Design a protein around this ligand. Structure first.
Ligand SMILES: [Zn+2]
Lengths: 577, 32, 233
């Protein structure tokens, strides 16, 4: 009967490996789950018996061949495999001599120290279980397991890497029942993978000195080409944090070369060239980036990427998507003052986002970043720094056309804190307005400066009384965003009141922004320009002393740029008179 | 150079560009 | 459906994404939305679906996220909701569409997917926004959001054209529980000249055991006693 069970395990292991090497995407996973259910049934048949010593090395061979092909298909380990480990371990314990895996492992390794001749399979089981606890981030007790494996005198070695290196695989793995993978093949993987994860954590925690060692360890040995890239890329960032640009460049270049997937490098390239301020190069890298991200096999084995994590947003291996990036490009461009270019980028952005009905979806920017309306604004703001004002309006038209079916229907207009206006709707109106200024139309402009200002006063934005939806968390709630946006619409108006010659009205509106937001300072400049005209001495000096008594946090992009865009050059020059 | 095996491959890159044996550039660069 | 005893086995050829761990799925246009069981954390997957008459393929996954909200007989259910202009689902009226999900969704003319779950939890997800990679994972809290929590498993979602005055532009979003808290939702725009959603959570008879929507604000539902009907018109 053990003849037939071993013949069956060997048969299904040959099926699995034939499928891994050969075949098409379906027939692969069809034969793989075929073999997984064969191994399931065979494990049930062997686990039916109150295991004998000669039944044990086949049962553990089956447990290994099952767990490997289970987690390589799922493309992740879980705790079902750990319960199956507990099952097989207490099955080894009940033969010769319960509570939990850690003490069960201690007692099973004491039983293995008696040398029953299944240590080939016990070391392979430690590799699987070690991988599990590695993918589960359980690195304290993994030290305890491998510590019990080796001498208990290696107890002070809390670092895993030394401990895994000293842990030898037991044997050349003599003519036993067939296995899909050897303990040393798993040891290699464990080493590079752990090296890798320690390195990333040390990098993100501002220790890119420590990282270099572990990661070079990740370079040296088995590390598949795809990972190799990733590691080097970390190094880009490490030397980048250091100051050492060129080492960085060199690694990055390799990463490119060795790459089939060189999104992430050029992203570090960008950050680097920013650190120099080499704006020209900066933008280029990113352009290239986008086309890169334009263009786009799983073995039934335990490879590294299985044990690798999904990276964070703080990683230098965080690379978004096409659309998300294009946004960066346009964003970055807009801050520099390449407004025209910026626009075209932003329109291409928008084209992508909205027009994508036919192909694969092309997504919007993620919400540590700006929401889909903060963006359209940035679209229209560039279009204003082009002097493309009749476009900037076909945008703010299309915007308030889609979003009618939200808005505040403004009956408080007749009844005139309580109703709600998301900051962005107040602003659309502000910029509709600046747009009309470039096309030179006092009236219909000062329509829009007053119509903003009302939706900043007979509304508060800060109105979530009901969790009714999804919202701008960040951009469109800041009291900083509000007191800066007011201060603007009032500044925007005060100018138009001087273009028509009503220095009384302009005075009112400027004096109002001051009283409101005292740390824009372009507010004080316009008022003191007004005062130097009319009523210099007393007023002016009283506000000098106030400014010098007084002496950016998260302002969203469409407004920053718009403040910079209106603001004047001899501003400090005026404040020193 | 002021910042190992990479720095050797970099001098190899420069040598392949200039058509100079790597020794000449390495010596010149170390001296400078 | 032509498909060249009147009994027929499928061959495993016709298999596509043997993921095995997948409960529930829907269709849009050219898109496939599955919902995959795991350990505790259920994640929603999303695949292309080939628009040309080809080999009937999945493609590569665009999108996965974790229904972090969801931690385990009752098969959860999903729904498609497309707004006006942009098929096996429900279009709303742009007022509602805008009220539930918000601006992002409305702007992008994003078809949105509602998962009810065995708890009773009724979570929606914005399919423009579910595009991710290894270097670019789903955040849960971004991307899936949670509307109302019925405290019993969910049988049925739809939308309903109340005010009746093929692509019908519904005004009212309908959920059901099992023990029979049903949940209609509407547009108000009341008393603040401001949009607020009229909630009720009515509390019907029976175990409820299947539902449907038919011409003009009438739901046709089962008790285990009798086939019963409701008006919302
Ligand atoms: Zn926003």
């Amino acid at each position: 009967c053990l003849d037939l069970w071993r013949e069956k395990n060997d048969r299904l292991v040959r099926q699995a490996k034939v499928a891994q090497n050969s075949g098409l995407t379906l027939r692969r996973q069809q034969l793989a789950q075929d073999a997984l259910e064969g191994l399931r049934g065979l494990l049930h048949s062997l686990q039916g018996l109150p295991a004998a010593v000669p039944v044990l090395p086949l049962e553990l061979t089956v447990t290994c061949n099952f767990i490997i092909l289970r987690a390589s298909l799922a493309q992740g380990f879980t705790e079902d495999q750990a319960q199956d480990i507990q099952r097989s371990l207490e099955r080894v314990l009940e033969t010769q001599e319960e509570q939990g895996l850690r003490e069960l492992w201690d007692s099973v390794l004491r039983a293995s120290c008696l040398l029953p001749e299944l240590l080939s399979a016990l070391h392979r089981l430690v590799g699987l279980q070690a991988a599990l606890w590695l993918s589960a981030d359980r690195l304290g007790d993994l030290a305890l397991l491998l510590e019990t494996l080796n001498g208990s005198q290696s107890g002070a070695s809390k670092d895993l890497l030394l401990l895994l290196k000293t842990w030898s695989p037991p044997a050349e793995e003599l003519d036993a029942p067939l296995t899909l993978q050897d303990a040393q093949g798993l040891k290699d993987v464990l080493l590079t993978a752990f090296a890798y994860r320690q390195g990333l954590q040390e990098l993100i925690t501002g220790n890119p000195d420590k990282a270099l060692s572990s990661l070079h360890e990740a370079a040296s040995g088995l590390c598949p080409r795809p990972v190799l890239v990733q590691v080097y890329t970390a190094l880009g960032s490490c030397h980048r944090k250091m100051g050492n640009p060129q080492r960085a460049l060199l690694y990055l270049v390799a990463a490119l070369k060795e790459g089939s997937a060189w999104g992430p490098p050029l992203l570090e390239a960008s950050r680097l060239y920013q650190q120099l301020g080499d704006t020209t190069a900066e933008l280029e890298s990113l352009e290239l980036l986008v086309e890169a991200l334009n263009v786009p096999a799983p073995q039934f084995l335990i490879e590294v990427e299985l044990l690798l994590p999904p990276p964070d947003l703080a990683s230098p291996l965080h690379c978004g998507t096409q659309s998300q990036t294009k946004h960066i490009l346009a964003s970055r461009c807009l801050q520099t003052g390449r407004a025209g270019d910026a626009a075209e980028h932003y329109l291409d952005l928008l084209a992508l986002l909205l027009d994508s009905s036919e192909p694969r979806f092309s997504p919007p920017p993620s919400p540590p970043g700006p929401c889909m309306p903060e963006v359209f604004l940035e679209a229209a703001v560039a279009l204003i720094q082009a002097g493309r004002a009749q476009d900037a309006l076909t945008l703010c038209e299309e915007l308030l056309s889609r979003t009618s079916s939200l808005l505040p229907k403004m009956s408080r207009l007749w009844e005139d804190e309580l109703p709600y206006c998301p900051l962005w709707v107040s602003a659309t109106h502000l910029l509709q307005g600046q747009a009309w200024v470039q096309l030179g139309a006092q009236k219909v402009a000062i329509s829009e400066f007053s119509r903003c200002l009302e939706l900043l006063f007979r509304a508060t934005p800060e109105e979530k009384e009901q969790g009714a939806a999804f919202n701008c968390e960040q951009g469109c709630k800041s009291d900083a965003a509000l007191q800066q946006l007011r201060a603007a619409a009032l500044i925007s108006r005060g100018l138009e009141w001087v273009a028509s010659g009503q220095d009384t009205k302009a005075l009112q509106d400027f004096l109002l922004s001051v009283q409101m937001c005292p740390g824009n300072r372009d507010t004080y400049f316009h008022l003191l320009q007004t005062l130097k005209r009319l009523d210099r001495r007393d007023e002016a000096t009283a506000l000098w002393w106030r400014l010098e008594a007084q002496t950016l946090w998260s302002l969203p992009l469409y407004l920053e740029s718009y403040l910079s865009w209106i603001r004047p050059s001899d501003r400090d020059a005026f404040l020193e008179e | 150079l002021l910042e190992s095996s990479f720095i050797g491959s970099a001098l190899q890159d420069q040598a392949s560009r200039l058509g100079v044996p790597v020794g000449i550039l390495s010596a010149g660069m170390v001296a400078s | 459906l032509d498909h060249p005893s009147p009994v027929i086995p499928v061959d495993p050829d016709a298999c596509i994404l043997p993921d095995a761990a997948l409960c529930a799925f829907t269709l849009l246009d050219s898109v496939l939305v599955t919902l995959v069981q795991g350990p505790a954390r259920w994640k929603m997957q999303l695949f292309e679906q080939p628009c040309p008459g080809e080999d009937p393929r999945p493609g590569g996954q665009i999108g996965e996220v974790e229904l972090s909200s969801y931690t385990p007989h009752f098969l959860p259910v999903l729904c498609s909701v497309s707004p006006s202009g942009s098929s096996g689902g429900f279009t709303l009226e742009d007022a509602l569409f805008g009220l539930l999900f918000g601006a992002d969704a409305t702007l992008l003319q994003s078809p949105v997917v509602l998962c009810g779950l065995p708890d009773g939890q009724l979570c929606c997800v914005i399919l423009k926004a579910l595009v991710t990679s290894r270097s670019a994972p789903g955040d849960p809290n971004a991307l899936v959001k949670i509307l109302h929590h019925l405290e019993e498993p969910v049988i049925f979602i739809g939308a309903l054209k109340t005010e009746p005055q093929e692509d019908v532009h519904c005004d009212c979003l309908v959920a059901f529980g099992h023990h029979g808290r049903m949940l209609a939702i509407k547009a108000s725009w009341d008393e603040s000249g401001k949009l607020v959603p009229e909630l009720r959570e009515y509390c019907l008879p029976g175990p409820v055991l299947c539902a449907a929507c038919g011409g003009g604000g009438r739901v046709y539902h089962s008790t285990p006693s009798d086939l019963c009907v409701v008006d919302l018109s």
